[PDB]
């Protein structure tokens, strides 16, 4: 009982802590910045190959190549310039939640509700693809994967823990376990030193590659969380909710710096994106339609309607140059 | 224009046409999802049949094949990945029918039945009710009265009107009568017949689905 | 992988001969095949070749009419059938592998090669050399020139560096004119422009010793080049 109130002692000795040093009237200091207008995004081209709902699309590296997975047991690479396919590869669980691509180009890990991390080889010899390696160990359902090099993967899984694995040896390396929920997402950060992942606590927390031990927790949220992203700088991250709000935390800060929402939205956000300046925020809603938001003021830019259902992920090129949405319609656009 | 080109276009036309394949071929086939209880009646209904996280189950019956997805060995948030599942055919519900003394677990299974039937996704796929154990509830009924878990129930002892008021029971908590039907069945470890029922109910399905997508319904 | 060619021998002229191509460690049915003949004592020339299905064909200029080409998928085997043997048929036919999506690289496998005797608007490629003598340790340059720009309104020239050591099939070294093949040592190098293109060898050992061939795949029939040889 004493251990208890000595903890939550604490809790509020940090509340005040970050109060303390907590002047922002961010509002006040940004209100002069001229705003940038009316964006008008136009799909450019359309990919129609999938026969069902696809969860998962990533980018490469090359800005060209992509891809994505759906529920009828196919993940297929995408030509974004000329719209064909690349390639085509037969998975054996056709629960898949998540998918990943290489930054190098020579693997594509995808995974999902089977408990197991699917790792595929592109580029070999006798043509067609392999399964390289198969990571198990999890005991929920794997939420999100990314890659830091060509032999280590981290994964979020559905039991309230984040692993760390090298595939030569399909070993747990490194394992954080800090969250009291399921845990839905996570971003690296560009230097692949640390990264943060959001649970449904309604709390994301901030670790670290190294040594396996989490250094921050923010909080502020009302509903649980779907969608994270790091900012281009490094130093702050959104995040979406079922609370129908997107806001931004700040690393150094260890506080909240903004949040967007609006009267007429009261449905949650499954994606979140920045673009490559920073200038705007990419957030995906259930209502068949994702925003644009202008990340230094809070107010709306634009909005991309072009879909028939949800909005299951969404990304934007490695140089900024075109952004993919997908949905449950089977069909992913991409906008310029 | 197209130097090369063509070869690439070719294998895209190629690799399209077999996921064309795949997919008439995937949809051919019929989905069903199996829920129930912890350990209640679904080791024995899979077993009756020739049949990590979920086993998938492959049997046919009658020209028709069917999907098994036993999810029960999953321990998460069931609303984090439930709409994973929309577009199956029907649900397949095991209830214990001698465990309504045992303990509490009657109430805590129609409260689970109570969620299933009316969630946000299942608004208008079927659900199959499959009663096991039926054996086992003749000799606990003479010696344990049925009102231990059903305080308002008054009637006399006998299997033959207590099995049909455990039926309504459990038949009466929908909320939607007018858009989805309830099939119940009693089951025992013998007496495989069970898959008969299944394909009846899977066939009315069907015809009411080609139905509703042939303008009629 | 493994190419094996079976079928050679000494045929009269005016009769026919069947040649067959055995594949093996490889997924046969996503590749595409290419037939590639040697003269004696001359360069390499293009016959044939089949699309992935078998939904496309193309047949060389002084060729077509005469030979038929054909796979079988199920049997992993490929087949070239010959009518109407002339003086001019004399050379040693090769199997060739190739495959067409974006960033893979074409004729990356030759088979070994079987010999076959008879009793008695195309881009021209031209070598500058013939001849060089080589020292070992040292730096080599191997010029190609073209009558046409390679260069596509896509931003890709297409232009391939073949090597035939002697006594064995020649190995793909360079893939559009930038790219290095897998297994080759960082010493080859490529470079150049529309119509003016270089090879470097730098800090060359031995067993490098051989012919270059200078390929382009803009558009069909595929011509090759004279060859420049490397003696030491």
């Known amino acids: 009982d004493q251990l208890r109130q000595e903890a939550e002692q604490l809790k509020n000795q940090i509340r005040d802590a970050r109060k303390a040093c907590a002047d922002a009237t961010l509002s006040q200091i940004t209100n002069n910045i001229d705003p940038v207008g009316r964006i008008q995004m136009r799909t450019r081209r359309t990919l129609r190959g999938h026969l069902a709902k696809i969860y998962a699309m990533h980018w490469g590296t090359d800005s060209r190549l992509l891809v994505s997975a759906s529920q009828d047991g196919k993940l297929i690479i995408w030509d974004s310039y000329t719209t064909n396919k690349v390639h085509a590869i037969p998975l054996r669980s056709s629960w898949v939640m998540t998918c990943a691509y290489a930054p190098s180009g020579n693997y594509v890990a995808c995974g999902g509700l089977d408990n197991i991390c699917s790792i595929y080889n592109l580029k070999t010899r006798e043509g067609n693809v392999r399964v390289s390696r198969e990571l198990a160990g999890h005991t929920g359902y794997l939420s999100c994967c990314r890659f830091l090099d060509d032999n280590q993967i981290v994964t979020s899984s559905g039991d309230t823990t984040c692993a760390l694995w090298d595939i030569e040896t399909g070993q747990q390396t490194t394992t954080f376990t800090g969250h009291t929920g399921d845990v839905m997402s996570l971003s690296l950060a560009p230097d692949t030193r640390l990264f943060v992942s959001g649970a449904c606590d309604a709390s994301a927390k901030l670790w670290d590659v190294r040594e396996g031990m989490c250094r921050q927790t923010f909080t502020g949220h009302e509903s649980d969380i779907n969608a994270i992203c790091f900012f281009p700088n490094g130093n702050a991250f959104a995040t979406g909710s079922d609370d129908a709000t997107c806001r931004l935390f700040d690393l150094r800060a260890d506080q909240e710096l903004m949040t967007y929402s609006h009267d007429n939205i009261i449905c949650g956000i499954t994606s979140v994106s920045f673009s490559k300046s920073g200038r705007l925020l990419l957030a995906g809603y259930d209502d068949f339609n994702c925003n644009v938001w202008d990340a230094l003021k809070a107010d709306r830019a634009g909005v991309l309607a072009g879909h028939d259902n949800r909005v299951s992920c969404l990304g934007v090129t490695d140089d900024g140059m075109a952004v993919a949405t997908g949905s449950w319609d089977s069909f992913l656009k991409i906008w310029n | 224009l197209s130097a090369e080109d063509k070869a690439a276009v070719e294998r895209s036309k190629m690799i399209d046409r077999n996921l064309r394949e795949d997919g008439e071929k995937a949809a051919r086939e019929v989905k069903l999802l199996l829920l129930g209880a912890g350990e209640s009646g679904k080791s024995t209904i899979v077993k009756q049949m020739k049949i990590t996280g979920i086993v998938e189950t492959h049997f046919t019956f009658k020209d028709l094949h069917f999907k098994m997805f036993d999810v029960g060995g999953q321990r998460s948030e069931r609303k984090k990945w439930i709409h994973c599942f929309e577009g199956v055919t029907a649900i397949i519900f095991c209830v214990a029918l001698s465990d309504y003394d045992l303990v509490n677990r009657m109430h805590e299974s129609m409260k689970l039945f109570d969620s299933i039937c009316n969630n946000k996704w299942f608004t208008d796929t079927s659900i199959i009710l499959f009663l096991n154990k039926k054996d086992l509830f003749e000799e606990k009924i003479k010696k344990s009265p049925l009102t231990i878990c059903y305080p308002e129930y008054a009637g006399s002892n006998t299997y033959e009107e207590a099995a049909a008021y455990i039926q309504c029971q459990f038949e009466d908590l929908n909320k939607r009568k007018d858009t989805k039907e309830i099939y119940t069945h009693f089951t025992c470890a013998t007496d495989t017949k069970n898959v008969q029922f299944v394909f009846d109910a899977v066939t009315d399905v069907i015809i009411k689905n080609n139905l509703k997508d042939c303008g009629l319904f | 992988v493994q190419l094996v060619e079976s079928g050679g021998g000494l045929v009269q002229p005016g009769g026919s001969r069947k040649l067959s191509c055995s594949a093996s460690?490889?997924?046969?049915?996503?590749?595409?095949m290419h037939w590639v003949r040697q003269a004696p004592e001359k360069g390499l020339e293009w016959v044939a070749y089949?699309?992935?299905?078998?939904?496309?064909?193309y047949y060389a200029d002084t060729v077509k009419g005469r030979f038929t080409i054909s796979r079988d998928d199920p049997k992993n085997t490929l087949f070239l059938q010959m009518t109407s043997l002339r003086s001019e048929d004399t050379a040693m036919y090769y199997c060739?592998?190739?495959?067409?999506?974006?960033?893979?690289?074409?004729?990356?496998?030759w088979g070994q090669g079987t010999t076959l005797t008879v009793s008695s608007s195309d881009i021209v490629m031209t070598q500058a050399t013939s001849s060089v003598p080589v020292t070992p340790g040292e730096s080599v340059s191997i010029s190609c020139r073209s009558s046409k720009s390679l260069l596509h309104s896509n931003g890709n020239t297409y232009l391939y560096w073949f090597l035939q050591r002697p006594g064995q099939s020649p190995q793909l070294l360079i893939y559009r004119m930038s790219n290095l093949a897998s297994g080759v040592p960082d010493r080859f190098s490529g470079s150049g422009s529309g119509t003016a293109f270089t090879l470097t060898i730098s800090r060359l050992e031995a067993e490098d010793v051989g012919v270059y061939y200078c390929?382009?795949?803009?558009?069909?029939?595929?011509?090759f080049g004279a060859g420049t040889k490397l003696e030491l």
């Open positions: 460690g490889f997924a046969f049915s996503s590749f595409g």
């Open positions: 089949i699309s992935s299905g078998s939904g496309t064909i």
């Open positions: 390929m382009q795949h803009l558009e069909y029939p595929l011509t």
């Open positions: 060739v592998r190739s495959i067409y999506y974006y960033g893979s690289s074409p004729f990356d496998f």
